[PDB]
Enzyme design. Structure first.
Site, PDB file in Angstrom:
ATOM      1  N   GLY A 221      46.757  37.318  39.713  1.00 43.92           N
ATOM      2  CA  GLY A 221      45.417  37.299  40.275  1.00 43.92           C
ATOM      3  C   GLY A 221      44.751  38.587  39.876  1.00 43.92           C
ATOM      4  CD  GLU A 222      39.629  38.600  38.510  1.00 46.13           C
ATOM      5  OE1 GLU A 222      39.196  37.436  38.395  1.00 46.13           O
ATOM      6  OE2 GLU A 222      38.877  39.600  38.521  1.00 46.13           O
ATOM      7  N   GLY A 223      42.826  42.180  41.250  1.00 46.42           N
ATOM      8  CA  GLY A 223      42.676  43.154  42.335  1.00 46.42           C
ATOM      9  C   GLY A 223      41.211  43.552  42.416  1.00 46.42           C
ATOM     10  CB  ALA A 224      39.388  46.266  44.176  1.00 49.07           C
TER      11      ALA A 224
ATOM     12  N   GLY B  41      41.352  45.649  38.583  1.00 45.94           N
ATOM     13  CA  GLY B  41      41.967  45.042  37.407  1.00 45.94           C
ATOM     14  C   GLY B  41      42.544  43.641  37.609  1.00 45.94           C
TER      15      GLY B  41
ATOM     16  CG  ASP C 229      39.100  44.679  48.979  1.00 50.46           C
ATOM     17  OD1 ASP C 229      38.318  44.033  49.722  1.00 50.46           O
ATOM     18  OD2 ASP C 229      39.289  44.370  47.770  1.00 50.46           O
TER      19      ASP C 229
HETATM   20  C1  LIG Z   1      56.852  31.920  43.483  1.00 45.54           C
HETATM   21  N1  LIG Z   1      55.668  32.777  43.273  1.00 45.54           N
HETATM   22  C2  LIG Z   1      56.042  34.145  43.581  1.00 45.54           C
HETATM   23  C3  LIG Z   1      54.867  35.082  43.218  1.00 45.54           C
HETATM   24  N2  LIG Z   1      53.586  34.602  43.807  1.00 45.54           N
HETATM   25  C4  LIG Z   1      52.504  35.569  43.925  1.00 45.54           C
HETATM   26  C5  LIG Z   1      51.180  35.174  44.076  1.00 45.54           C
HETATM   27  C6  LIG Z   1      50.205  36.196  44.095  1.00 45.54           C
HETATM   28  C7  LIG Z   1      50.522  37.534  44.002  1.00 45.54           C
HETATM   29  O1  LIG Z   1      49.576  38.511  44.029  1.00 45.54           O
HETATM   30  C8  LIG Z   1      48.115  38.174  44.118  1.00 45.54           C
HETATM   31  C9  LIG Z   1      47.434  39.552  43.824  1.00 45.54           C
HETATM   32  C10 LIG Z   1      47.240  40.439  44.887  1.00 45.54           C
HETATM   33  C11 LIG Z   1      46.670  41.707  44.672  1.00 45.54           C
HETATM   34  C12 LIG Z   1      46.252  42.109  43.390  1.00 45.54           C
HETATM   35  C13 LIG Z   1      46.458  41.198  42.328  1.00 45.54           C
HETATM   36  C14 LIG Z   1      47.027  39.934  42.539  1.00 45.54           C
HETATM   37  C15 LIG Z   1      51.857  37.919  43.851  1.00 45.54           C
HETATM   38  C16 LIG Z   1      52.305  39.345  43.683  1.00 45.54           C
HETATM   39  O2  LIG Z   1      53.502  39.606  43.782  1.00 45.54           O
HETATM   40  N3  LIG Z   1      51.382  40.329  43.419  1.00 45.54           N
HETATM   41  C17 LIG Z   1      51.473  41.742  43.511  1.00 45.54           C
HETATM   42  C18 LIG Z   1      52.611  42.435  43.747  1.00 45.54           C
HETATM   43  C19 LIG Z   1      52.651  43.805  43.850  1.00 45.54           C
HETATM   44  C20 LIG Z   1      51.475  44.535  43.730  1.00 45.54           C
HETATM   45  N4  LIG Z   1      50.355  43.859  43.450  1.00 45.54           N
HETATM   46  C21 LIG Z   1      50.308  42.517  43.384  1.00 45.54           C
HETATM   47  C22 LIG Z   1      52.794  36.927  43.820  1.00 45.54           C
HETATM   48  C23 LIG Z   1      53.304  33.157  43.775  1.00 45.54           C
HETATM   49  C24 LIG Z   1      54.536  32.364  44.125  1.00 45.54           C
END
Ligand SMILES: CN1CCN(c2ccc(OCc3ccccc3)c(C(=O)Nc3cccnc3)c2)CC1
Ligand SMILES: [Cl-]
Ligand SMILES: [Cl-]
Length: 263
Positions: free
Chosen positions: A13-16, A18, A122
């Site tokens: 996904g996207e953050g604030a 990146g 956020d």
């Molecule tokens: C089985 N799968 C496992 C993983 N699944 C899953 C779905 C969305 C995620 O993040 C959305 C996101 C949230 C914030 C910013 C960008 C994206 C993460 C994830 O682990 N992201 C993460 C981790 C550490 C630091 N930052 C983000 C994992 C979906 C289901």
């Protein structure tokens, strides 16, 4: 070089600021979350510095980073449970005991951040992730900043965040206190979990739904879907004047927050 050690399998996904990817290690198959940024040097340096500070069970784990010329690689724990966003059924929410548990965990993580002088800025369900036992972890430090250093508080003076989650003072005052803004967003998250809908597009006078709340029309949605105990908490959290808004120490004394619901 990065591409020899890791495979980018998909977008998470996207953050604030990146975008983050699921990376899988070409040797060990270890799956991790990676944020890739082509260097602001100033902001990314700041994001990394905050990330290095973090150590708490309800904050995501930061593994470290690699710079390859201009591009930075930020490695973090993958959340096997995905996001809280995906547990909220539209127009329904989730079972109240599950919501309370997640709200307890969210408050634990926010207390931890505020106690090291960091404001997230956020908080919303997209940024609240779940590990394999559904423990909540606060993610995405791209807007996070220092609000207290050497025991002196600094006011914030920049608008950021996500409109349906921002506190009203952020839209009106030239400077404002960091903590009440994060407390407010927690209230919107709690609303979302219990009603499966957001209450307003933004907390401004031009928004009718926000006026309705200020006039106490809790016979309307989303409020009508929420039980009287959590609603009473939401009346203390979503208070327009940040100096009259409930603080986290007092949230911890609230009747609903302390109600036994779940094994
Ligand atoms: C089985 N799968 C496992 C993983 N699944 C899953 C779905 C969305 C995620 O993040 C959305 C996101 C949230 C914030 C910013 C960008 C994206 C993460 C994830 O682990 N992201 C993460 C981790 C550490 C630091 N930052 C983000 C994992 C979906 C289901
Ligand atoms: Cl300090
Ligand atoms: Cl939502």
């Amino acid at each position: 070089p990065f591409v020899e050690d890791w495979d980018l399998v998909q977008t998470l996904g996207e953050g604030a600021y990146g975008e983050v990817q699921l990376a899988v290690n070409r040797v060990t198959e270890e799956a991790v979350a990676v944020k890739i940024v082509d260097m602001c040097p100033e902001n990314i340096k700041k994001e990394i510095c905050i990330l290095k500070m973090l150590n708490h069970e309800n904050v995501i784990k930061f593994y470290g980073h690699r710079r390859e010329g201009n591009i930075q690689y930020l490695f973090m724990e993958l959340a096997s449970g995905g996001s809280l966003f995906d547990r909220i059924e539209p127009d329904i929410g989730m079972p109240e005991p599950d919501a309370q548990r997640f709200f307890h965990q969210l408050m634990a993580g926010v207390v931890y951040l505020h106690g090291i002088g960091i404001t997230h800025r956020d908080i919303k369900p997209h940024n609240l992730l779940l590990d394999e036992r559904d423990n909540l972890k606060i993610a995405d430090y791209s807007l996070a900043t220092v609000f207290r250093y050497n025991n002196r508080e600094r006011l914030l003076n920049k608008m950021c965040g996500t409109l349906p989650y921002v506190a009203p003072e952020l839209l009106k005052r030239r400077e404002f206190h960091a903590e009440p803004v994060d407390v407010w967003s927690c209230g919107i998250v709690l609303t979302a979990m219990l009603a499966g809908e957001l209450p307003w597009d933004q907390p401004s006078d031009s928004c009718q739904e926000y006026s309705d709340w200020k006039e106490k029309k809790t016979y309307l949605n989303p409020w009508k879907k929420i039980d009287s105990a959590p609603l009473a908490l939401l009346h203390k959290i979503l208070v327009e004047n940040p100096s009259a808004r409930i603080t986290i120490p007092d949230i911890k004394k609230d009747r609903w927050y302390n109600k036994p619901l779940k094994k």
